[PDB]
Design a protein around this ligand. Structure first.
Ligand SMILES: NC(=O)c1ccc[n+]([C@@H]2O[C@H](COP(=O)([O-])OP(=O)(O)OC[C@H]3O[C@@H](n4cnc5c(N)ncnc54)[C@H](OP(=O)(O)O)[C@@H]3O)[C@@H](O)[C@H]2O)c1
Ligand SMILES: CCc1nc(N)nc(N)c1C#CCc1cc(OC)cc(-c2ccncc2)c1
Ligand code: NI
Length: 165
């Protein structure tokens, strides 16, 4: 029914941890640069909790916040209250990025066409997890090692998977 490409944008560790105490468990400025590079000029779909942790609209992108709160408003952001409302707001977009967190990844999981997933080779303490996925009829179309240096202290890889079906 929907004609935009629904892409997940996520970074997780070896046990699918994405968050700890409503924040990121790691700092990888280089990984964040990849995110900015890949998401330039495309809508970001964010769970209300994800957005409020970020704290500000991200520039050069439509910021869409998913909440059940019908009175929720943020300057410089758009507000949606369901998957279908997001689809209406984005009906003419080429590609949208589901930017997290876990509740929002769960929400859009039946509709995901493309997965941009960074895998971090470390086991962090965490409380928030990326959902399990069946990768039947998906294919890895890109893989590259991330930059590990004094400012990026973990090993990690960028992966891109595309749904065939
Ligand atoms: N590593 C990564 O790639 C990454 C990415 C993003 C986030 N994170 C982390 O993940 C954590 C946040 O994830 P989270 O799951 O706790 O929160 P979240 O998914 O970002 O947002 C949860 C909120 O989304 C709204 N929501 C949930 N289901 C909805 C529905 N069916 N319809 C309309 N609105 C709905 C609700 O807002 P209301 O309560 O206002 O109704 C809910 O409280 C943080 O630790 C964050 O740092 C990590
Ligand atoms: C950067 C990891 C990340 N990597 C990947 N591959 N996908 C993601 N969805 C996220 C993520 C996230 C959630 C997130 C939380 C946050 O503070 C708590 C700040 C940002 C952010 C800071 C500066 N420019 C833009 C965004 C993003
Ligand atoms: Ni180095």
């Amino acid at each position: 029914h929907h004609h935009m490409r629904v892409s997940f944008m996520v970074a997780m560790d070896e046990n699918r941890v994405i968050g700890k105490d409503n924040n990121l468990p790691w700092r990888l400025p280089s990984e964040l640069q990849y995110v900015k590079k890949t998401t330039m000029g495309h809508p970001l779909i964010m769970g209300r909790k994800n957005y409020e942790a970020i704290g500000r609209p991200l520039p050069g992108r439509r910021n869409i916040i998913v909440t059940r709160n019908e009175g929720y408003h943020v300057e410089g952001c758009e507000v949606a209250h369901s998957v279908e409302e997001v689809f209406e707001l984005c009906k003419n977009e080429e590609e949208i990025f589901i930017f997290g967190g876990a509740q929002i990844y769960d929400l859009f999981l039946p509709y995901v066409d493309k997965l941009y997933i960074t895998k971090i080779h470390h086991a962090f303490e965490g409380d928030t997890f990326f959902p399990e996925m069946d990768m039947t009829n998906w294919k890895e179309v890109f893989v590259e090692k991330g930059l590990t240096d004094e400012k990026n202290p973990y090993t990690y890889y960028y992966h891109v998977y595309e749904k065939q079906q």
